[PDB]
Amino acid sequence: RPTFYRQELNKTIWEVPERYQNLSPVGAYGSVCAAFDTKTGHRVAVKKLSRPFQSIIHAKRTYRELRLLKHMKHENVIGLLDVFTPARSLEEFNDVYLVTHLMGADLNNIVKLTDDHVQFLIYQILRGLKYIHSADIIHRDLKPSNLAVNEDCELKILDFGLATRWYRAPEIMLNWMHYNQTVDIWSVGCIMAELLTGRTLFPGTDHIDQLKLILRLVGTPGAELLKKISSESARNYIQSLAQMPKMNFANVFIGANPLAVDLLEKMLVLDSDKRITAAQALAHAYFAQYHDPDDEPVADPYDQSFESRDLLIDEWKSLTYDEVISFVPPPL
Ligand SMILES: CS(=O)(=O)N1CCC[C@H](NC(=O)[C@H](CCC2CCCCC2)NC(=O)c2ccc(CNC(=O)c3cnc4ccccn34)cc2)C1
């Protein structure tokens, strides 16, 4: 068991093993310090979870986050370098600590991207989404601020706890029945649009505005979609918002590679059953230069059955302790 040391930063008591030195606070992103990992001579990020077991929902949101992190073993998805408690036993266990690579910048703070810069960046998100989606995991919050970039334009999908609405699929904001993985693909269409145009595609001030801007471009729902909607009152409302003067795809992305617009019209589809999947989108001609189908791996089986459970503070806590302890650090 390693030797821990104690220091107070931004009125927070940090306790970490002696391998993490020179902790400086970075941020807005919660309780996060940049640290020098003495093991690997690489700068890392330490996150001290804020009162992880305060209630029942913190204790479950804490277990989930650690389960998710321990699962992600992909090039285009944030990985867990280390997790630790200073705690001796289960009895004295209150503080959880996560270690990740340091993210120099996000899609925003690295942004007139060339057609090839757009191809490469959207390829990597779809490659990261294929993997995530194969484990029946949905991001639900894909936006540029959740996409880390490096010196050499390589991208990781992650999820901080910080506008969402801009990248948010209509079915979520209209409260339709059928959610599916492809809520993320709409987001990738909204993010890619922005990289091509240099402007946010659906800059909504509120969710109703947001939907008026979406319907103006993607059209009013066609019959095949309307069939799947039960309530008269939802079917009316989606049409009450599709009154704004129609806009066409060929004029919004004029200048853009015709295969990028071809891909965007398959992403930005109202019908989430007809929307292209990460897996299908990787095989689109737009990525001809990068698509290797022997190098687009799926995820291992992910035990998601805990999501359904209603347990006590002590069970969620106990389960989380058993994850921290069973964590084998990845090989370099
Ligand atoms: C309430 S909640 O706790 O349940 N919670 C609420 C919403 C967000 C949480 N999402 C999550 O669980 C995902 C796991 C889900 C998974 C799903 C699909 C594939 C991607 C994500 N956790 C993170 O992404 C994560 C990211 C960074 C860090 C620490 N490193 C830093 O912050 C850092 C590193 N470099 C820098 C530079 C500057 C500032 C900070 N940094 C810790 C966790 C859930």
Side-chain angles (χ1 to χ4, degrees), residues 1-10 12 14-23 25-41 43-50 52-60 62-72 74-84 86-87 89-90 93-106 108-109 114-150 153-177 179-237 239-312 314-331:
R1 166 192 149 72
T3 307
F4 289 71
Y5 76 93
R6 203 198 181 285
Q7 66 173 150
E8 211 185 348
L9 289 156
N10 287 15
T12 327
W14 288 70
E15 293 160 40
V16 310
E18 53 175 22
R19 66 189 271 181
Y20 307 108
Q21 294 294 308
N22 307 323
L23 274 61
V26 67
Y29 293 72
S31 276
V32 182
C33 288
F36 193 95
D37 181 19
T38 308
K39 189 134 201 290
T40 63
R43 277 274 281 288
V44 299
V46 191
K47 188 185 170 80
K48 179 201 170 75
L49 285 82
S50 205
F53 317 117
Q54 171 183 356
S55 62
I56 280 169
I57 289 299
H58 275 239
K60 188 180 177 191
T62 292
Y63 178 81
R64 177 188 294 110
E65 172 162 29
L66 182 60
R67 286 294 313 285
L68 282 168
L69 281 161
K70 282 190 80 173
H71 185 81
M72 304 309 177
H74 200 271
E75 265 147 325
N76 306 119
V77 183
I78 191 171
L80 187 57
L81 291 167
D82 209 8
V83 44
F84 63 81
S89 76
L90 167 59
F93 172 45
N94 281 7
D95 298 322
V96 181
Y97 290 85
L98 299 167
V99 187
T100 82
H101 293 271
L102 195 51
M103 311 312 188
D106 53 26
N108 279 96
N109 318 321
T114 61
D115 186 48
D116 189 22
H117 273 303
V118 176
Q119 280 173 59
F120 181 49
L121 284 165
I122 301 305
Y123 179 73
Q124 287 178 89
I125 305 157
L126 292 170
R127 191 169 182 275
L129 274 186
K130 165 171 191 154
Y131 178 87
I132 291 159
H133 285 179
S134 67
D136 284 79
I137 302 164
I138 302 165
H139 196 285
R140 295 196 191 72
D141 208 21
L142 273 178
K143 48 167 176 283
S145 68
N146 282 336
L147 293 166
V149 183
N150 65 10
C153 307
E154 290 175 299
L155 169 152
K156 281 162 194 307
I157 309 179
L158 29 77
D159 207 6
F160 307 123
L162 293 318
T164 302
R165 57 176 177 280
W166 292 338
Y167 308 98
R168 179 53 66 85
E171 54 265 41
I172 293 178
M173 298 180 304
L174 284 165
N175 198 50
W176 294 344
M177 221 60 28
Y179 291 62
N180 70 351
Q181 299 173 337
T182 67
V183 294
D184 291 346
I185 293 286
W186 180 278
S187 312
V188 167
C190 288
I191 284 163
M192 169 167 162
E194 192 169 0
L195 297 183
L196 296 167
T197 59
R199 53 183 286 174
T200 167
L201 186 65
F202 302 128
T205 64
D206 56 65
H207 294 236
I208 288 158
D209 191 51
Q210 193 68 220
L211 287 155
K212 279 192 196 189
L213 295 169
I214 293 175
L215 284 155
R216 184 145 174 262
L217 189 63
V218 310
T220 195
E224 187 193 61
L225 176 51
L226 288 185
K227 286 213 186 211
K228 302 171 196 210
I229 295 171
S230 20
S231 128
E232 187 62 27
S233 43
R235 228 157 36 241
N236 293 179
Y237 192 41
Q239 292 169 348
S240 159
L241 303 165
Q243 309 297 52
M244 235 178 209
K246 183 52 165 94
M247 276 219 76
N248 76 110
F249 258 106
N251 205 25
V252 183
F253 302 115
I254 196 153
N257 178 354
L259 300 175
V261 174
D262 186 14
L263 174 58
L264 280 162
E265 295 172 313
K266 286 176 157 73
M267 292 195 163
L268 299 180
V269 155
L270 211 59
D271 194 338
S272 81
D273 298 352
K274 290 291 155 150
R275 200 176 295 160
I276 198 167
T277 58
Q280 286 152 342
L282 289 174
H284 189 284
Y286 184 52
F287 300 118
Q289 174 162 30
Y290 296 101
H291 172 49
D292 178 33
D294 286 332
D295 201 345
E296 287 162 7
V298 290
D300 275 33
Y302 171 62
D303 179 357
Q304 187 164 187
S305 46
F306 76 90
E307 293 290 359
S308 88
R309 303 301 157 218
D310 293 350
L311 301 169
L312 305 173
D314 271 313
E315 294 191 293
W316 288 122
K317 212 157 100 147
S318 165
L319 289 163
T320 313
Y321 186 74
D322 288 324
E323 294 301 331
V324 170
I325 290 292
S326 45
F327 173 86
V328 188

